Amino acid sequence: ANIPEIENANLKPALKDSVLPDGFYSTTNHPTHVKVNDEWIEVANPKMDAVIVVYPEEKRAETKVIRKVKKGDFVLIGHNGIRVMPPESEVSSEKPKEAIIKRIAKEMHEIREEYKKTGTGGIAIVGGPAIIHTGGGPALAKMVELGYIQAILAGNALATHDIESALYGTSLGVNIKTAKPVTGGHKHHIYAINAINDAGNIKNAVESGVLKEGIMYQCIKNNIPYVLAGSIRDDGPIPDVITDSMVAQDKMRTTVMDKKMVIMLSTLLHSVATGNLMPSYIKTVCVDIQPSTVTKLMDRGTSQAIGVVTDVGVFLVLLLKELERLEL
């Protein structure tokens, strides 16, 4: 009897770097197992939109995106010996928001407690500069200070305007505490970049007392790693920024892979980029003011994902109050 599920997988060597052989299997985001020489191999690093490369003599297998496939790599093809292991809703802003924020706070508190007990898991934030423009920067910094955040994935703008807020009270020249523009404020963000360039990097700015508050400050003080991916729209960038997209992508992937939850705060491109890198067993909270953006995040979803159509500015402020309440 031929039963594809328990037949040995078929493999084909890639004929060129980054060229997938005909019949290649496209991965889900689910933990996958492949049968090779009569033994089930657990495929490392689950990720959607990739192929599986097999190392039969090492009895190992890993997920590889196309750009990392090398000539000679044995790519899984066909339909035999593939076992997928999945882990065990209309988008609208018109849903009770205090309620969902309270429920999110409860979940974060439970995740943080388990991280404290075990030292693994925890929460990554994917953040864009709207967090700062909407006045949500201090709330997010306080979450980092309270131990809720185990990593931040962002880019030059979030870091720059968070630092501009610290140094000058403004984001793109708008005063955070009053929402009024400051005369000549257009230069403030370039002055912030210059200040970090002079310090050498963010760590130096913090350790030397140039930078004394805010998200990046809290990350340095609490040893929270962050990844700042460079973008074609960047001013500067600051020294910490990884300018090559593919390098930044690799670093993002390794940063999120062991988290229990990723919270995506209003940045479609960074949030999609991050979701693309996540296995299905990570919980996702997707937050944006545009329903179409949230929808695009709810489309490539992990098995546990919620979308909240709301303004990150007020969302972060109320969320922090709910977290502060739980601290008591």
Nearer to its own copies, 122 or 313 (CB): 313
Nearer to its own copies, 115 or 237 (CB): 237
Residues in region 237-276 near its own copies by CB under 8 A: 237, 243-246, 248-249, 252, 268-270, 272-273, 276
Nearer to its own copies, 55 or 191 (CB): 191
CB of 89 to Ni ion, least distance (A): 7
Residues in region 253-312 near Ni ion by CB under 5 A: 304
Taking CB atoms within 8 Å and a gap of at least 24, the contacts of 3-8 are 4/79, 4/80, 4/81, 5/80, 5/81, 5/82, 5/83, 6/35, 6/81, 7/35, 7/80, 7/81, 8/35, 8/36, 8/37, 8/38, 8/80, 8/81
Residues in region 288-307 near its own copies by CB under 8 A: 289-292, 295-296, 298-301
Segment contacting its own copies by CB under 8 A, of 33-41, 43-51, 112-120, 140-148:
43-51
Q: Is 270 annotated as a binding residue?
A: yes
Nearer to Ni ion, 92 or 223 (CB): 92
CB of 313 to its own copies, least distance (A): 4
- What residue type is 48 in one-letter code? M
Nearest-CA neighbor of 274 among 299, 256, 298, 247?
Answer: 256
Nearest-CA neighbor of 197 among 234, 160, 165?
Answer: 160
**Residue 30 is a binding residue for its own copies (CB under 8 A):** yes
CB 162 within 8 A of CB 220: no
Both tokens of 264, joined, read 């995506």
Q: Which of 8, 10, 80, 197 binds its own copies (CB under 8 A)?
A: 197
